[PDB]
Amino acid sequence: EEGKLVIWINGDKGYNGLAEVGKKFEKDTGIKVTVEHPDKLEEKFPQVAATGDGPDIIFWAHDRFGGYAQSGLLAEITPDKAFQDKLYPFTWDAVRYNGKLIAYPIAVEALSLIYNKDLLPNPPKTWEEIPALDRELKAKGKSALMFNLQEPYFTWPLIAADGGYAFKYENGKYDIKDVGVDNAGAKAGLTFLVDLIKNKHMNADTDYSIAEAAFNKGETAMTINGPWAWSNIDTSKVNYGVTVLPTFKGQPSKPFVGVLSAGINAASPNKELAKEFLENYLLTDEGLEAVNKDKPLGAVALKSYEEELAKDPRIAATMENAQKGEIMPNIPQMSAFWYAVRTAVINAASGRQTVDEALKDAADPGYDSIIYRMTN
Amino acid sequence: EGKLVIWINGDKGYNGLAEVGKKFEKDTGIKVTVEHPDKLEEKFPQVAATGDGPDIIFWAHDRFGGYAQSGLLAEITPDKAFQDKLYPFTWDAVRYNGKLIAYPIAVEALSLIYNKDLLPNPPKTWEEIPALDRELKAKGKSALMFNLQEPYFTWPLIAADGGYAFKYENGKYDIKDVGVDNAGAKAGLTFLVDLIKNKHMNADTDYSIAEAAFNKGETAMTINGPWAWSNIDTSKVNYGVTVLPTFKGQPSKPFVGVLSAGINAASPNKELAKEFLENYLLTDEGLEAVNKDKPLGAVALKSYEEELAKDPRIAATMENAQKGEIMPNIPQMSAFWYAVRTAVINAASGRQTVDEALKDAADPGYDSIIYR
Ligand SMILES: OC[C@H]1O[C@H](O[C@H]2[C@H](O)[C@@H](O)[C@@H](O)O[C@@H]2CO)[C@H](O)[C@@H](O)[C@@H]1O
Ligand SMILES: OC[C@H]1O[C@H](O[C@H]2[C@H](O)[C@@H](O)[C@@H](O)O[C@@H]2CO)[C@H](O)[C@@H](O)[C@@H]1O
């Protein structure tokens, strides 16, 4: 680590694009940059950083950074007024924790409906229509919809539709005691999805790669996913639309919005180098274009680059879905929250627990929660 | 790599242990370093989870279930002749999902420790402690000081009239059935907070403060374990070790711990750790070296115990232990202790009331300390 840069980022993002950026950096400065995408980095980072190890720079959606900052794993960052002016105000707000800035914002992510325009000329406006749709679509030996049920992020817009929420957001701060995941909005959302399963419109163990291959091979009319997925759909030549998520009980799907963000390890001795890389190389039209050409970032934080992208109707649809949803909390409880809800969705989907039972556990984990099973 | 590093708590006989380790070094040339880092029981899971940390970790057995569940401990395989040397109940304390995950060392329970001169007659009941504090306060003394910062020291009183942690039914702990906010729990902690509210005890007394006060002859009574008696010997106070007081007529029920040694699952020195524990530490002279530094309590090694059981201080330790309960070793233990610690400190300081402090420990929400 002594005079080089190690960067971690998720394997669904443009880390080859990003590596090309670190080759530029190395070519100008002589500093070696290594980009890695380890499995479950969002869990490894706080483990290795707890002992003063880890990468120099960590990329994740902003929801996790509050917890790292509470744990002291992140350096405070100082961008001057000029630098700050280059990025949207709400992107900075996403990386502000106890009044400090703890990361650089990169890009705004939200989920959308992605549909195969061909076998499905009109999408649905609602979830309601999907069992009747999936049934006529099985006639051609197809299914209507496949998406990741192993990550609760992908089910969340449905759960939030009729009023499921995470922690109530009250004038200023988030109410940690007031947890929305087992209210009747939440219950109705997920019970819908479980019925789709009970009645075989969806399989309970579909994961990210199954939904992706199923979509990209024309096997299923629809999927739910973010900007990063558009690339591989381009490669497959599937004719797709990106559009508004379907409503439920006639309210809009509400996706949790993430700000892909870039933090500097508090234990790093290359903090100054990390600052030059992030500010002068990545967050430029050409740094981001390079990542974005690998896998699309969504609506970027950099105003100069976003000007171009905003003209793409995938990006406008992404943004309209982001409009109906909610910026993720970055509080330290988020991590336990996701772990609970991931288990609760998987449990109810597989019949291991009833909807009421699974979400009650997610809303109020006792000592029987997975969160305290000290599992791995 | 060809080295042994041992972690043991700062209150135990770690110099004694180091004497055992010099003997191992003398015979095998393997260097043994003993350390006692602060907050060892939290550090160990964090460093061990990356693949470093000590070769050998000592703690009471309640924590080893979570370590083992986390993958951090090598399964130990003493043969039958080695097993017959230690008491069966001490092996049971280190069994997790059927496999032995540590060597047992000693049996610990809290006793009442009292100053015989200040108080030729210690109280039988928690209830008479206030009046007796009144008496002592006029003499520039106080009845009782003990660590209020660690729930371990309060547990015997929470448990007296029916507090429990997790219900134990038909060979098994039901982690949905938590007893820490039942009426027994509330009663017990309410008594303690009432003691504090009326200034018979100060809500920030910690281990250090309570030991200095007893050993300087400032307070008639403390609540402590066997490891404490060495410093009392040195201070020359004339003390007895006895039955904890009763609460609403019931015996105090201290959690019973078994000091245990686990071997890091990630150690390259696993065979050496076994030789060290089986052939040096767990012997009359190994344990004697530890014990002479800070007493272990009633040891798991039957040959050494026979000598110790004669000590009237061990007899009382075993009496308190028999009224108490072996701690669970389930992986939920770590988070339970953190919830209860905060509940006790919060109730004692007036941050929360008894009832809501305990409700939060019985049922940790996202608002609880365990999630910050
Ligand atoms: O499923 C819970 C998960 O949701 C979010 O993770 C997203 C991530 O934000 C996106 O960049 C993309 O990579 O997909 C992930 C879902 O698999 C939260 O950021 C994360 O903390 C949470 O665990
Ligand atoms: O206070 C909660 C605490 O209780 C026990 O720790 C004891 C330990 O067993 C004794 O050896 C002695 O050192 O005092 C400790 C309390 O300060 C549990 O063993 C421990 O895991 C728990 O957190």
Side-chain angles (χ1 to χ4, degrees), chain B residues 9 11-12 41 59-60 62-63 108 147 150-153 227 327 337 341:
Chain B
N9 212 33
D11 56 356
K12 307 296 195 334
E41 76 281 27
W59 197 259
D62 60 304
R63 304 234 169 206
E108 295 167 358
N147 185 7
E150 280 300 333
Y152 183 73
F153 295 89
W227 56 82
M327 283 187 277
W337 284 128
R341 175 171 32 256

Side-chain angles (χ1 to χ4, degrees), chain A residues 47-48 50-51 70 167 176-177 179 332-333 336-337 340 361-369 371-376, chain B residues 46-47 49-50 52 66 69-71 166 175-176 178 331-332 334-336 339 361-367 370-372:
Chain A
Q47 275 154 228
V48 304
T51 41
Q70 202 56 53
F167 299 100
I176 65 184
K177 331 147 88 72
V179 167
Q333 297 66 28
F337 180 80
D361 276 321
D364 210 43
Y367 285 109
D368 73 288
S369 171
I371 307 178
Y372 312 103
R373 211 175 307 174
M374 311 222 78
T375 89
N376 174 104
Chain B
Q46 263 168 202
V47 299
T50 50
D52 37 41
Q69 183 80 351
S70 308
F166 301 103
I175 54 148
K176 255 131 161 134
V178 182
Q332 290 68 35
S334 195
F336 179 82
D363 197 15
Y366 291 116
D367 55 84
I370 316 177
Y371 292 123
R372 271 93 202 253

Side-chain angles (χ1 to χ4, degrees), chain B residues 103-285:
Chain B
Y103 293 90
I105 308 306
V107 182
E108 295 167 358
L110 291 164
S111 295
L112 188 72
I113 305 163
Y114 73 111
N115 176 333
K116 280 192 199 159
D117 298 317
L118 287 172
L119 191 56
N121 216 309
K124 276 203 172 330
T125 72
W126 271 96
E127 288 86 346
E128 82 206 65
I129 277 167
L132 165 60
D133 182 67
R134 250 192 297 276
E135 245 162 52
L136 284 158
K137 278 299 177 50
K139 190 167 284 169
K141 318 259 89 157
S142 73
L144 172 72
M145 296 179 79
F146 66 93
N147 185 7
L148 302 175
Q149 308 307 319
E150 280 300 333
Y152 183 73
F153 295 89
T154 291
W155 192 259
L157 175 53
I158 283 162
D161 186 60
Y164 62 87
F166 301 103
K167 171 56 54 58
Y168 189 49
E169 188 98 33
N170 300 323
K172 299 199 39 83
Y173 286 98
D174 176 24
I175 54 148
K176 255 131 161 134
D177 187 347
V178 182
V180 85
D181 67 339
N182 68 15
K186 282 149 166 193
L189 180 58
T190 292
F191 195 79
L192 181 51
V193 180
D194 282 346
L195 285 180
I196 297 179
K197 267 162 174 43
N198 298 108
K199 310 172 289 299
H200 309 299
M201 289 198 62
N202 197 284
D204 48 34
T205 301
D206 68 353
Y207 188 85
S208 204
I209 287 280
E211 166 175 50
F214 185 78
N215 296 7
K216 295 204 228 152
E218 278 157 37
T219 185
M221 291 175 294
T222 182
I223 290 180
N224 219 319
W227 56 82
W229 313 332
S230 296
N231 290 342
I232 327 175
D233 294 342
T234 300
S235 86
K236 272 66 202 31
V237 163
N238 177 46
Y239 67 106
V241 179
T242 192
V243 197
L244 294 155
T246 66
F247 180 58
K248 318 172 64 157
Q250 326 250 45
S252 288
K253 310 193 185 20
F255 252 145
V256 184
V258 176
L259 180 72
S260 317
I263 299 175
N264 196 335
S267 186
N269 310 294
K270 287 201 203 23
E271 177 50 49
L272 295 174
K274 174 182 216 214
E275 286 163 49
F276 175 76
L277 294 164
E278 295 188 8
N279 301 333
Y280 290 73
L281 186 57
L282 275 164
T283 57
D284 291 3
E285 64 271 15

Side-chain angles (χ1 to χ4, degrees), chain A residues 10 12-13 60-61 63-64 109 151-154 228 328 338 342:
Chain A
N10 208 45
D12 55 359
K13 311 306 193 313
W60 195 259
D63 61 307
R64 301 221 164 216
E109 325 180 331
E151 291 293 344
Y153 183 70
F154 293 92
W228 54 79
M328 280 186 290
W338 283 119
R342 164 179 331 179

